[PDB]
A paper describes a structure:
Efficient γ-herpesvirus lytic phase replication requires a virally encoded UNG-type uracil-DNA glycosylase as a structural element of the viral replisome. Uniquely, γ-herpesvirus UNGs carry a seven or eight residue insertion of variable sequence in the otherwise highly conserved minor-groove DNA binding loop. The UNG leucine loop is a conserved structural feature which is responsible for widening the DNA minor groove and flipping pyrimidines out of the base stack and, in the case of uracil, into the UNG active site for catalysis. kUNG, in common with other known UNGs, comprises a single C-terminal globular domain made up of a four-stranded parallel β-sheet flanked by six α-helices, with an additional left-handed coil of three helices at the N-terminus.
In the kUNG–dsDNA structure, the kUNG leucine loop extension (residues G222-R229) is ordered via a hydrogen bonding network centred on the side-chain of Q212. In the kUNG–dsDNA structure reported here, the orphan base of nucleotide dA27 is actively flipped out of the DNA duplex by the extended segment (common to all γ-herpesvirus UNGs) of the leucine loop, a feature not seen in any of the previously published structures of UNG–dsDNA complexes from human, Deinococcus radiodurans, Thermus thermophilus and Vaccinia virus. The extrahelical conformation of nucleotide dA27 is conserved in all four monomers of the crystal asymmetric unit where the base is solvent exposed and forms no contacts with neighboring molecules. Hydrogen bonds between the NH2 of the adenine base in dA27 and the phosphate of the neighboring nucleotide, dT26 rigidifies the orphan base in the crystal providing clear electron density. Indeed, this fact is exploited in UNG activity assays which rely on the fluorescence increase upon liberation from the base stack of 2-aminopurine bases in the orphan position. In the kUNG–dsDNA structure however, both the adenine base and the deoxyribose moiety of dA27 are significantly displaced from the duplex stack with a distorted backbone conformation being stabilised by hydrogen bonding between the guanidinium head group of R223 in kUNG and the phosphate moiety of dA27. The position in the base stack usually occupied by dA27 is taken up by L220 of kUNG in a manner strikingly similar to that of the strictly conserved ‘doorstop’ leucine L217 which displaces the substrate uracil base from the DNA helix flipping it into the UNG active site. In contrast, nine residues of kUNG (S215-R223), including the entirety of a five-residue helix (P216-L220), intercalate between the DNA bases presenting two leucine sidechains to flip out both the substrate deoxyuridine and its partner nucleotide in a duplex nucleotide-flipping mechanism.
Author numbering: 24 to 157, 161 to 163, 165 to 258
DNA sequence: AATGTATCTT
DNA sequence: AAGATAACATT
């Protein structure tokens, strides 16, 4: 039963996975369950497909693609988002800094819960959906690729924000003639250390948020109100 | 000043 | 698979 695939029903329908692939996903989830007896995996099993519960597949406006979940216990299942009682991590600080600098009426919030963006059509996905406490480069690759390939062919006029070189590698999956693809180095401060001589654009000054909104406005779609967050 | 978060090259 | 890099906001 599709209950074991942990995906929200709208997604289980949209993606329309084959029997073969449903068994490949079920085997991976059972492998992660086994791993949890030994080591600690983030996020918890229940919160793996959290991004699928917030965001409806047909409603997607922007696709933000990260590297992998946070590894200090703050991963929520929705990429780069933290719990409202939880302290905003460095990566999320950099995102809020670029929003402050670019978006006109934006003001950085006290809380880091991006649930509001998902309800607005922002898919916060990572290339790998799990992490060992304190890397799972494991076998998620195929599924996150399947999601991107599925969004790119089924939906029209979406924006794909790729951050870091693990995200950038997904570039050939997106149909450039149908959607907008914007690439930048990862928001993490460590991305300013490695890749100081990088040919890829720096996250600081990338202006992805306004650029995405201009594309949506141009294609007569509703914009993302980035500033619509707690406080 | 010390600390805690990728990218590239081998 | 793993080590050098010497960024930078926050503490």
């Amino acid at each position: 039963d599709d209950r074991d695939l942990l995906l929200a029903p709208k997604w289980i329908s949209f993606l329309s996975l084959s029997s073969f692939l449903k068994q490949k996903l079920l085997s991976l989830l059972r492998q992660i369950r086994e791993l949890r007896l030994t080591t600690t995996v983030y996020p918890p099993q229940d919160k793996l497909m959290w991004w699928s519960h917030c965001c409806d597949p047909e409603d997607i406006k922007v696709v933000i693609l990260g590297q992998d979940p946070y590894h200090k216990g703050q991963a929520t299942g929705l990429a780069f988002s933290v719990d409202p009682q939880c302290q905003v991590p460095p990566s999320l600080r950099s995102i809020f800094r670029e929003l402050e600098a670019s978006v006109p009426n934006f003001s950085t919030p006290s809380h880091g819960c991006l649930d509001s963006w998902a309800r607005q059509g922002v898919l916060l996905l990572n290339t790998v959906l799990t992490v060992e406490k304190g890397s799972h480069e494991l076998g998620w690759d195929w599924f996150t690729s399947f999601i991107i390939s599925s969004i790119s062919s089924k939906l029209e006029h979406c924006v794909f924000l790729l951050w870091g070189r693990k995200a950038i590698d997904r570039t050939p999956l997106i149909n450039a003639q149908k959607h907008l693809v914007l690439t930048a180095q990862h928001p993490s401060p460590l991305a300013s250390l490695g890749g100081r001589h990088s040919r890829w654009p720096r996250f600081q000054g990338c202006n992805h948020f306004n650029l995405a909104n201009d594309y949506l406005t141009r294609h007569r779609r509703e914009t993302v109100d980035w500033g619509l967050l707690e406080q």
